[PDB]
């Protein structure tokens, strides 16, 4: 069991500073608490439900840093909405690229998969809240991102505009994922607004899952865990909760 304190699965995946301890952790059952809340940069995930499910089922946060060649842009971008130790910081697993010398060259970065397992890449697109802010960050008014593999193409166009301010931020980050199978190659073409990945996640298949529950974690032996608590399994039927895990 890995009891998710203050962290959601997605936050633990990205690496919000409050949630830094959940690094390279493994789990059979992730327990998400209803009190969880985010304290990094406001973000949304298109098809959130699918991303949450796929991370949960893999059951590992094993992360390997990978060396992308980002020649020509500023790395390690940082924000005042996501403070780690009273210093400005960012999601530990994402790499915010900004302009260097007021130029953002067209990126065309490639990274081959020469291993024998799949790779899960998480990256994002930044949507500034003003056309003004767009210039300060990337020096280019427009923007378009296109990440491709031999099998898939994801073309995202950021949307400049003010959104309701959540914790004083009128901008958002949209999170996307792409899977790269053995023998394939990831290729990221970006002309701006790209929140770059710092590496890949290992992706496994197994018995792992995720559960919403507010029950305290105990020192005991029980095979099925539900949000009401663990239950004995001597009886063939039970009436406590339709959401269950184990035998």
């Amino acid at each position, epitope marked *: 069991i890995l009891d998710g304190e203050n962290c959601t699965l997605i936050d633990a995946l990205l690496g919000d500073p409050q949630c830094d301890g959940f690094q390279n952790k493994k789990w059979d059952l992730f327990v998400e608490r209803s009190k969880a809340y985010s304290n990094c940069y406001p973000y949304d995930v298109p098809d959130y439900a699918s991303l949450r499910s796929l991370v949960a089922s893999s059951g590992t946060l094993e992360f390997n840093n990978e060396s992308f060649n980002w020649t020509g842009v500023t790395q390690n*971008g*940082t*924000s*005042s*909405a996501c403070i780690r130790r009273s*210093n*400005n*910081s960012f999601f530990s697993r994402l790499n915010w690229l900004t302009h260097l*010398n*007021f130029k953002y060259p067209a990126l065309n970065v490639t990274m081959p998969n020469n291993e024998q397992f799949d790779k899960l890449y998480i990256w994002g697109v930044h949507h*500034p*809240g*003003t056309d*003004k*802010d767009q*210039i*300060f*960050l990337y*020096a280019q*008014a427009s923007g378009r991102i296109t990440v491709s593999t031999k099998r898939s193409q994801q073309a995202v166009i950021p949307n400049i505009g003010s959104r309701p301010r959540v914790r*004083n*931020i*009128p*901008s958002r980050i949209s999170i996307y994922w792409t899977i790269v199978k053995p023998g394939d190659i990831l290729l990221i073409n970006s002309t701006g607004n790209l929140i770059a990945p710092r590496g890949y996640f290992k992706i496994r298949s197994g018995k792992s899952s995720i559960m919403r529950s507010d029950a305290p974690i105990g020192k005991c032996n029980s095979e099925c865990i539900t949000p009401n608590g663990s239950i004995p399994n001597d009886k063939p039927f039970q009436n406590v909760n339709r959401i269950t895990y184990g035998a």
Partner: antibody, heavy 123, light 108 residues
Framework: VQLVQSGAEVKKPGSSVKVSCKAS????????ISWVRQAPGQGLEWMGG????????NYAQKFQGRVTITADEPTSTIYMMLSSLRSEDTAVYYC?????????????????WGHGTLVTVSS | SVLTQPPSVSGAPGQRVTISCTGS?????????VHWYQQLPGTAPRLLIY???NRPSGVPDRFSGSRSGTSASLAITGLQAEDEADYYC????????????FGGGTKL
């Protein structure tokens, strides 16, 4: 936006400078407050710079070590600390906000200026 | 300081055209622009040109400029006796930070 800098009468023997420049009502969040000095009898000289919402303030490498810029959430103040004052730091210090334009060879200009604190060093 | 500036003379003429020319080598000629900040005596300087040709909100058609290759020049087409003030040029630099190169500024 209107920039409100004032104070800083005298700091004679050592390091005592501190200036505030509380920005009022700036809409676009990823703005800037770039500090600029003007010695009496000489032109401008870029001297600092910061984005409160972004990170890692930027200096001019002729002051790296003897300057430090910070910010604040509730008040929008922009605090600058000078270390090891000398007679070569008698000037007027301005705080300006940068503005944009979309063109080749982009370069940010000083849209709105404050008023200037009269830092003075004397016996 | 880095940008070469007409040291202290604009040779204040009558109502004719007055031009201040600033230039520097690569790291200013590598594609970056210039601006033009007029400074009334004492008061904080006021912006006049950005991008070598534009004019901000509230500047007449008396001022103009242009960056021609590896040099830039203000061009005060008209002139009047209530516009006597300094003129500073900003550019960018690539000495690994080099942001606000200003110069010395002309006069009158």
């Amino acid at each position: 936006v209107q920039l409100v800098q004032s104070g800083a009468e005298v700091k004679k023997p050592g390091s005592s400078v501190k200036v505030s420049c509380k920005a009022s009502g700036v809409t676009f969040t990823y703005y800037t407050i770039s500090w600029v000095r003007q010695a009496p009898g000489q032109g401008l000289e870029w001297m600092g710079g910061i984005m409160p919402m972004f990170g890692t303030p930027n200096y001019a490498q002729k002051f790296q070590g003897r300057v430090t810029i910070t910010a604040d959430e509730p008040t929008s103040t922009i605090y600058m600390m000078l270390s090891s004052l000398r007679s070569e730091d008698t000037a007027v210090y301005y705080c300006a906000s940068l503005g944009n334009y979309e063109s080749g060879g982009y370069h940010p200009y000083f849209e709105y200026w404050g008023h200037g604190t009269l830092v003075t060093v004397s016996s | 300081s880095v940008l070469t500036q007409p040291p202290s003379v604009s040779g204040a003429p009558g109502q004719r055209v007055t031009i201040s020319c600033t230039g520097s080598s690569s790291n200013i000629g590598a594609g970056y622009d210039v601006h033009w900040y007029q400074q009334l005596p004492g008061t904080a300087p006021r912006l006049l040109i950005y991008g070598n040709s534009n004019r901000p909100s509230g500047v007449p058609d008396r001022f103009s400029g242009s960056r021609s290759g590896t040099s830039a020049s203000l061009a005060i087409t008209g002139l009047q006796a209530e516009d006597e003030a300094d003129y500073y040029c900003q550019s960018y630099d690539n000495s690994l930070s080099g942001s606000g190169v200003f110069g010395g500024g002309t006069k009158l």
